[PDB]
Amino acid sequence: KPHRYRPGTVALREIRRYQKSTELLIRKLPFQRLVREIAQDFKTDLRFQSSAVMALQEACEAYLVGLFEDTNLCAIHAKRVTIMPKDIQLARRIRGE
Amino acid sequence: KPHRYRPGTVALREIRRYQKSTELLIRKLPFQRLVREIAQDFKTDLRFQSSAVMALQEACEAYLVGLFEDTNLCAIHAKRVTIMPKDIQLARRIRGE
Amino acid sequence: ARAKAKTRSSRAGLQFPVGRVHRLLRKGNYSERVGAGAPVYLAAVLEYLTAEILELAGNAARDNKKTRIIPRHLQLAIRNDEELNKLLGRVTIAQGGVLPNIQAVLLPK
Amino acid sequence: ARAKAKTRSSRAGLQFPVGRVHRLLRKGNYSERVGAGAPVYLAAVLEYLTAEILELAGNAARDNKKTRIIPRHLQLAIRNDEELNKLLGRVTIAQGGVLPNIQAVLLPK
Amino acid sequence: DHPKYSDMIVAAIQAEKNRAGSSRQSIQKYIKSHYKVGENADSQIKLSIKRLVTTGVLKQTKGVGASGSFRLAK
Amino acid sequence: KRSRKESYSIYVYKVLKQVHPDTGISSKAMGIMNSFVNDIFERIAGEASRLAHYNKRSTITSREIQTAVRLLLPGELAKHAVSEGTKAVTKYTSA
Amino acid sequence: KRSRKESYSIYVYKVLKQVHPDTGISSKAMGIMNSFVNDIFERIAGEASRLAHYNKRSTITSREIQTAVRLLLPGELAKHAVSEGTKAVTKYTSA
Amino acid sequence: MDIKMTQSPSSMHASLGERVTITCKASQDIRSYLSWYQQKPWKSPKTLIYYATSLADGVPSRFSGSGSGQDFSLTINNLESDDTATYYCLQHGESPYTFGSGTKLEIKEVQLQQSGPELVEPGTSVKMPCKASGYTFTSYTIQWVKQTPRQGLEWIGYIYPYNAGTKYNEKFKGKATLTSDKSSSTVYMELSSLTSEDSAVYYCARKSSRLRSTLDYWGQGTSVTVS
Amino acid sequence: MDIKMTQSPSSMHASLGERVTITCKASQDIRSYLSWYQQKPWKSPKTLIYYATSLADGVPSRFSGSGSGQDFSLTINNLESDDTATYYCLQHGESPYTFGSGTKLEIKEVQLQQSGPELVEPGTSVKMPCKASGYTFTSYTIQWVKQTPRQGLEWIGYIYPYNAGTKYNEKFKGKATLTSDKSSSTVYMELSSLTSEDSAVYYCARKSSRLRSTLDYWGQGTSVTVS
Amino acid sequence: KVLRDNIQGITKPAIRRLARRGGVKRISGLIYEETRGVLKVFLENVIRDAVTYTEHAKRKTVTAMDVVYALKRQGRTLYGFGG
Amino acid sequence: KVLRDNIQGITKPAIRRLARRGGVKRISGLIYEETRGVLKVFLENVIRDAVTYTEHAKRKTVTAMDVVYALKRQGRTLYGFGG
DNA sequence: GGGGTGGTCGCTGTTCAATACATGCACAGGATGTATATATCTGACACGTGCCTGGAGACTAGGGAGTAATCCCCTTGGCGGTTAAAACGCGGGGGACAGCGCGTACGTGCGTTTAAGCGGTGCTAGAGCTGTCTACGACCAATTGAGCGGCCTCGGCACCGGGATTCTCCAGGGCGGCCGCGTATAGGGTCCAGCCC
DNA sequence: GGGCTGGACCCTATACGCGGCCGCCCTGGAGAATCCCGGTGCCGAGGCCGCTCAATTGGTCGTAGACAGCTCTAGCACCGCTTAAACGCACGTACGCGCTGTCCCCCGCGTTTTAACCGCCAAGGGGATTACTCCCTAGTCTCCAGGCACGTGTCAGATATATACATCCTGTGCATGTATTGAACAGCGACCACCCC
Q1: Which chain positions lie within coiled-coil regions (chain E)?
Q2: Which domain holds residue H103?
């Protein structure tokens, strides 16, 4: 019968590989479209430097990673291993956001 | 038989009483002693304005009150009612200290 | 002879001192030149913010039946408003106290 | 006739440009006047910080058996140190990644 | 319509013949889902399990008190 | 003779008399309001100075102060402050 | 015609050559180091300006810069930066 | 001690193109906290003037207002076909907000979703929702207004989602109850013990916590009818 | 390959007031990362010079350091009776830290609590604590040094309490193990498979993570004796 | 021309990758929508400031320096883009 | 003359009162010592900067203005004592 | 007139209604805390006065910013493939969570101790201010070399392919404690011989 | 002459160990991931050359701050007294934590889809620069009035007292359920009236 890793084993390897790696994790073209959409609500027919979009992507991914670390710590504090929106909300509200 | 309130009713009454008031909760003169003891490790024979010591006490009590709010939120997140040193530690780490 | 003096605050209709704001702008090392309209605009903005906070604090004091605004009323005024709370999120008000607030899970059945 | 020019960097024994630092201090609207020793002292401090971070990052790069420093090595060097990390806590380093860190309770067994 | 709890419990145990002990929640679900018992059914179910194990008829294969799993023990 | 040192107390009091004619204000609340005025003044002036530096402009104008106000003040507060400042600047210009 | 830009790349490379003769550095790492130098420059200069303003001094001196260094840099970074700067200032005065 | 709004011209006729003036007299000094609203028939009102002088977002400069203290006025310069509607002044300087009696003039992105028509038997209770979108929910209070053909527009109360704070008109204590849902960004108003007088169209309206702000955006209105 | 330290003058006899000069050679360039230590008999060493020129805190200007690259020197100007002690040069420019052979001189609040002497039998294990106080525990590494009468001082390794990072000398891998406990500010060293050769005094020394910082404060030492 | 539904481009795989880099082992199903909301809020906050700087410059193109200034003003100092 | 152990002057009931103003209902027995450590760290951080400002001014009296500057430099702006 | 059997009475098994017990819920009232109305009084706030310095009026100079014109670069838009990633579906196991139980640690309350708070006095260090004077930082003219832009080459590292090691998963086997079934054992039931009625 | 008692032969109730079974633990082997090693190539890092502008040198000056001296505020030390807060101890309750069961919901893997990425090409918007100009602000001199220091009075709120209402807790009573047990009632063993031979 075919091989299958037990649940929660591949997640560790994914954590290891994405903590070793440094590349951006969100796809560039849909993130760019999202940025343009969001900016459309403040000023029409704006233009963007590729470096400006890259800087936005770097800042957003760093923010999300830093938030998920606190979400994981709150989940562990609840003696859980699954992170939940209650964990995200607790982390964000303690951070003063 | 002598009257007794059940555990937590006097606690709630004290919560209501102290959230309505505005005066300082830490004894002034021993807080001043602590301030002078700490400062003597940075410079000997320092003088202090009374206003400076009061400013220190205001800042310290505001910081402690906010920290206890975050600690209580962490404890509630753990489905507990009692605040614990692990709750204080989580509040501090998530806050960024 | 020189005409009758008229303050820039009165010329702009403001209460806050345009002259003092201009002198603080020039002496504060913000730039080597300062436009004429900048201190007027800044005095108007500061007067607006002061009027908003003072009116909210006065409303709170009136609700508390007190005729004089106190740091408790100021704390209530800023904290009970989301925009003012975001403006002064990193600020401590001396003798201001805290909002009466108890978590739902602590209340008795 | 006048003496051959001798850079203030060489006079102070520094690599960083004392003259450029002095120009930036004057043009930055930090004060009306700038003492002669301020750009020297500041350039020395900036040189010390640059040397510290670059040597830690070079050690990290050598430990990875690569010859040139990259943002990953800068990130590793900064985060593995209490004082540098607390100095640069609020800073994001592009393409720097994160430190490997898995919580103990998540490990098997 | 509910007889004395002894026969209800033994009937519940007899239906789902788990060899390692019938869990409390399984029989509490079953007897109330099949039959109809008053508002305080569950408390009387727990007390019935307790008194039966005190009489020694039922054997608690796992757990403590009422919280465990119980076997008929013939 | 003591060295005269300035504060915003009288202007805060005049604004108070405009918004609430019959209320008063304690000394501690007045000092807190002075601290508020100083803090907001410093914040806006700093943002305007940094805007001028970023744009390589030598002077701070009402446009710079306006952009600083839009950056720091939130939501409806920002647009109300902008409206008040624009009205005051227009009235001043019309003399 | 395009204007001349300005960066600390040469000085950072010279410091790198002093601390690790064989080690190189990437362009993006150089950009990050330029950002670091500019940020720390701005922090010390701003803190020294605030110190002068608090003490009503018109001049930013090495004492102001030293106090800013002690306020900003934590722990042993402060002591070693103070030592390096004091050495440089003494050598400059002697020469 | 409620501050009555007295609009002088109850109705008027005007040809196209000439200037029109409308007056609203305040019972007590409201310190310039007065707004003007245009309501075309079978549609929710739109804001024209706020702080008694300031044009609302998107309002053409044809409309203008003036006055302070107790005497306020509205002006329309270039009358157009669409300018036929009912104009209400609204004061909000003191806690019970009061609308003007209304002036019927005839001539020759923020969304507040609200529920549809309703039929209810007397003595029941009802829950009108108000789905808010297009803006940050907690920053703005939700204001509820009752419109009848006999009493005109009446202010019921408001909910502040930031802290769930409430205020109610004394005429609606107990009758109305306000609740908020930060997750769904929805506000609900409870009407208890429906009675014949409750046959009215109810509007939820957005208003900033800023004192000079006014009701700026309005829901489409819920027509509640009691049998 | 380990950097050899070479103090050329093994011992000097000198009178009071006169000058003495000690030298220390290096097998490879160490870029000024050399420190000087004064050890009185039955006493923990104290730091005199760091970064090859800088006087440590509380050290009088009598002591002077000089040199760079491979030639280094320590100079004492005005001798007193107290100067009778052994002086070691220590390099930390490369990962395996190496002390000098030691020079004997004869003349004619940061705290690190360490445990007392420990008698032990061969082949078992022992655990030595180092209780630090008076400073931010996580900010400084704890260094461990082994002092035998016949090899002098030997650097074993360090633990960084901030991230529990450790580095060990190749000679002591497996033999030594370092652990930390933030809650009690204590660092523990475990020695495995004790042998008669292991009989030595073990010191714990605080050293900052700064590259130019040296081992500055030392524990009183823990003598381990193997039967 | 008009962009309409691009928030869904922050896919579940992308959020999982971000959580893996964040050290998260097991992920609830509602984290995806919660994270999309949080990211939307953060992006709106940063981009509003960037556009304000661009408008002050009277430029029609948002630059990386404008983004860096917005981040620094929001306490998110970013190294590597000309800061 | 000297002071040695004034941290114990931040008493158990005082910490309880602070927790009550924080909305805390039930308190573990180790919370008192943990809070004493926290307060000690915070006071050290603030007083160090206040004394640094005092040394710069070449004064021997620490002033409320120095304390306010230290708090503001640490991001804890305090209203009521400045000026 | 005796042998023998159903009728009927006594003893007892079965079941039932009162006895007793346990749990779960509503309420009266007793104790305590809280909100409200009234009188006292004090010291902080608001007002009035002097004066003095910094803000305003009027005029000059020059340079900073506004505006027009030009270039070219870099942003936007489109098109065609190419996989890599995303979407979707499914089996399952392990984690969330609800309930039960226990013990201990934390709350509540009272009696004892202590030290904070307040007032009053005394003293002197040192912060604040003024005046002198000099060194040092700004400013300018002339110079020149250091730093920046552009061009080029070459080696560090990124990638690709291939072993070699390592870590995970689990199926099978060794090993131990609990349960079912058979056995040596003896207790008693049963057969043979002597004896007393 | 035959059953009772004694001794011996045979039927059967019994305590106990061995085999069967389920669970615990160990380990070897398959397989999938990870890391080391070698070869290739390409593009970015580092070096070289030209130039131009900004950093340096030499000199003048003017004012900012360093120093000295004086003054008088306020911070520190001390002591006594009151009483409120802290502390120590007892008791008990409810909450934290461990254990158990359920079930559903996330993970891992295979299959299908789609759209991001990359290379290529083209248009043109606007960002950057330069030249010209003018008006807007710095700077100076006069002068005067707005605001700050200081004094004073009175009323707003803090305080003390009494009262009236609200909340908490619990002891009691009531309602519903349960298992228990002496007895009300009928079935069978046994004593007696009476039939049959």
Answers
A1: none
A2: 5-107
Domain ranges of chain J: 1-83
CA distance H210 to C81: 9
Q: How far apart are CA I121 and CA I199, in angstroms?
A: 11
Query: Strands I103-107 and I11-14, how do they pair?
Result: parallel
d(CA K58, CA C69) in angstroms, rounded, equals 39
Domain check: are H103 and H132 in the same one? no
**How many structural domains compose chain C?**
1
d(CA G85, CA G64): 12
Resolution in Å, one decimal place: 2.9
Separation CA H207–CA H1 (nearest Å): 24
Amino acid, res. J9: G
Cα of H115 vs its chain's centroid, Å: 17
Alpha-carbon distances, residue B61 vs A13, B66, I143, K47, K65 (angstroms):
45, 9, 39, 15, 19
Crossing angle of helices G76-94 and D37-63, rounded to 10°: 130
CA A66 to chain centre: 8
Strand M within 7 A of E25 CB: yes
Chain M: bases < 7 Å from a protein Cβ? 23, 31-34, 44-46, 53-58, 64-66, 74-76, 85-87, 92-103, 105-110, 115-117, 125-130, 136-138, 142-150, 156-158, 168-171, 176-179
Among the partner-chain residues C29, C31, C32, the one whose CB lies closest to the CB of D30 is: C29
Conformation bin of residue H133: beta by default, left when phi > 0, alpha when psi is -120 to 50: beta
Domain co-membership, H87 together with H137: no
CA F15/CA I200 separation, integer angstroms: 79
**Which residue, C7, C79, C83, is CA-closest to C48?**
C83
Q: Where are the domains of chain B?
A: 15-97
Last residue of a domain, one of I48, I81, I107: I107
Query: Is there a contact between C5 and F49 (Cβ–Cβ < 8 Å)?
Result: no
Cβ proximity of K46 and K71 under 8 Å: yes
Q: For residue C94, give the H/E element and its range.
A: none
d(CA K71, CA K50): 8
Selection from A43, C87, A6 nearest residue F36 by Cα: C87
Shared domain for H212 and H115, answered yes or no, is: yes
Q: Of the candidates C46, C45, C47, C76, which has an alpha carbon nearest to the alpha carbon of residue C60? A: C76
E-state strands within B1-97:
47-48, 82-83
Can you read off the two tokens belonging to residue F70?
């839009």
Handedness of CA J59, J65, J68, J72 (dihedral sign): negative
Backbone angles phi, psi at E66, to 5 degrees: -90, -15
d(CA H11, CA H103): 5
Of I107, I125, I143, the residue at which a domain comes to its end is I107
Residue I26's alpha-carbon distances to F95, I9, I36, I71, I104, in angstroms, are 81, 14, 14, 7, 20
Q: How far apart are CA D106 and CA A19, in angstroms?
A: 15
Apex A79 CA angle, A75 and A81, nearest 5? 55
Which H/E stretch holds residue D87?
helix D82-87
The domain B15-97: what is its CATH number?
1.10.20.10
User: Integer distance in angstroms from CA J83 to C1' M109?
Assistant: 46
DSSP string, F25-88: E-HHHHHHHHHHHHHHHHHHHHHHHHHHHHTT-SEE-HHHHHHHHHHHS-HHHHHHHHHHHHHH
* Fold held by G2-95: Histone, subunit A (1.10.20)
The neighbour count for residue B13, using CB atoms within 10 Å, is 12
**Terminal alpha carbon distance of chain C:** 82
Distance (Å, whole) CA G20 – CA F74: 49
Q: How far is F59 from chain J (nearest CA, A)?
A: 14
Quote the tokens at residue J33: 């929508």
